[PDB]
Ligand binder design. Structure first.
Ligand SMILES: COC(=O)N[C@H](C(=O)NCCCC[C@@H](CO)N(CC(C)C)S(=O)(=O)c1ccc(CN)cc1)C(c1ccccc1)c1ccccc1
Lengths: 99, 99
């Protein structure tokens, strides 16, 4: 797929049977998801943005389907209005920027 | 170019004859650069993000050369963790996401 940037690059993601909308976000190092229960141990982390930092829960080796592509990796859960798919998962599905 | 995401997509930009590094960020609607003096009128603006709401200065119709590609568009100047090239300029330079 080619996705233009005229609009926010939102796509469908599935994680453990929850279906959500997420932003493909080449700026983000990590993937930050809206509040959700995930299985397994988590540890606190702090992630920075334009306004400062938010505290998130880091979960490792979480499977997320993104546009039919299987990804498995680190997911940070915290108070975001938008699910963001970061480089850690964007790389796994073979996502590039092109111009 | 085609740019993979195993590293941050940092490129060199040229603005007002100044060279800077900035992040190609599909998750940002807007372009936000660290504090700098640009010529011409600016408008105070407040923008929100992860962390919170910050004050920025909005400069319209600013030429910026991104990795050799010319844009002329709105640049926000304020306290950002990193210089951010957002969709408003990414679209100008023909940037798309592909997987
Ligand atoms: C531990 O390492 C980090 O903190 N890395 C930072 C990081 O990956 N942060 C993830 C936060 C989300 C990033 C960003 C979009 O890319 N956020 C938007 C998203 C939540 C919808 S955002 O920062 O909140 C944001 C909001 C609004 C605009 C313009 N209107 C631009 C940016 C990253 C970064 C990336 C983009 C913006 C701000 C920070 C970084 C931090 C410090 C230095 C370099 C990169």
């Amino acid at each position: 797929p080619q996705i233009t940037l005229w609009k926010r690059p939102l796509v469908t993601i599935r994680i453990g049977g929850q279906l959500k909308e997420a932003l493909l976000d080449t700026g983000a190092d990590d993937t930050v998801l809206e509040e959700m229960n995930l299985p397994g141990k988590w540890k606190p982390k702090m992630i920075g943005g334009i306004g400062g930092f938010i505290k998130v829960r880091q979960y490792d080796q979480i499977p997320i389907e993104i546009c039919g592509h299987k990804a498995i990796g680190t997911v940070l859960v915290g108070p975001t209005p938008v699910n963001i798919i970061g480089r850690n998962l964007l790389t796994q599905i073979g996502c590039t920027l092109n111009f």
